[PDB]
Amino acid sequence: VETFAFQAEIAQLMSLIINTFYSNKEIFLRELISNSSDALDKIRYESLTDPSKLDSGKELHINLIPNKQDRTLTIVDTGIGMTKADLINNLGTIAKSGTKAFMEALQAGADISMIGQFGVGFYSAYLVAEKVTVITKHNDDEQYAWESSAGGSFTVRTDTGEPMGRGTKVILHLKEDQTEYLEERRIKEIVKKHSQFIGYPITLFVEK
């Protein structure tokens, strides 16, 4: 396991999302679902001008896997995925510009639900999650697991867990009081209301 520090502005954003009073937390699902859709758009394209990219799985989709036992909600996509570099730089250093653009817009009329407009929508996961684990596999690199419970740092290690083919799974280890996001009808409700017209199939797994 390697340990890295969040660039100071990214750390300030995460303390903000984690510590600000905002009751409309359900937007986090919309924001993960959009990120997934974007990454699937990206492998779709890269496969037109190259059909070998789908050698790692031709199905382009999004699965929603709640788990009451583990108290996790996992969003999985068969999108482009991230290489070691994307994972490290994106998540922990390069969101610097967007966070500034976002925090600069909050103290200027914006509200938290506008986070994705500045490309930092991933961090809205900290509204319901105490820990986020990201599993990713890029055609060009091996499988990685990124993790953070905030606190100014994150970890990157090689993923021992089952291979996924190509894609990303964001595992949200929910806060004690947000278990309603492990509920079929509640997930169904947020998707219908927020992600109704996503161009890839969204499957909500059932428990047991």
Ligand X SMILES: Nc1nc(Cl)cc(-c2cc(OCCN3CCOCC3)c(Cl)cc2Cl)n1
Interacting span for ligand X (CB under 6 A) from 14-22, 31-39, 171-179, 186-194: 31-39
How near is the Cβ of 134 to ligand X at its closest, in Å? 5
Contact present, 73 and 182 (Cβ < 8 Å) = yes
Q: Is 154 in the site for ligand X (CB under 6 A)?
A: no
Pairing of the two strands 202-204 and 62-67: parallel
Instruction: Tell me the per-residue interface mask from 93 to 122 with ligand X, x by CB under 6 A, - otherwise.
Output: -xx-----------------------x--x
- The tally of CA atoms less than 13 A away on the side-chain side of residue 145 is 13
Residue closer to ligand X, measured from CB, 55 or 185 = 55
- Among 12-20, 23-31, 73-81, 157-165, which window interacts with ligand X (CB under 6 A)? 73-81
Size of the site for ligand X (CB under 6 A): 17
Q: Closest Cα to residue 198, out of 63, 56, 25? A: 63
**Is 122 marked within a binding site?**
yes
Q: By CB under 6 A, tell whether 92 contacts ligand X.
A: no
Alpha helices in 81-125 (DSSP H): 84-89, 96-106
The DSSP bridge partners found for residue 176 are none
Residue of 27, 60, 78, 81 that binds ligand X (CB under 6 A): 81
Burial call 109-118: b when 16+ CB within 10 Å, e when fewer = eeebbebbeb
Q: What six digits make up the tokens of 48?
A: 């037109």
Candidates 46-54, 91-99, 175-183, 186-194 — which segment interacts with ligand X by CB under 6 A?
Answer: 91-99
| Interatomic CA distance for residues 208 and 185, integer angstroms | 16
Structure tokens given for 77? 């996509």
| Among 179, 176, 185, 177, CA closest to 206 | 185
Q: CB of 208: closest distance to ligand X in angstroms? A: 26
38 is in an annotated binding site: no
Residue stretches of the annotated binding site for ATP: 35, 77, 96, 122
**Interface residues with ligand X (CB under 6 A)?**
35-36, 39, 77, 79-82, 90-91, 94-95, 119, 122, 134, 168, 170
Residue stretches of the annotated binding site: 35, 77, 96, 122
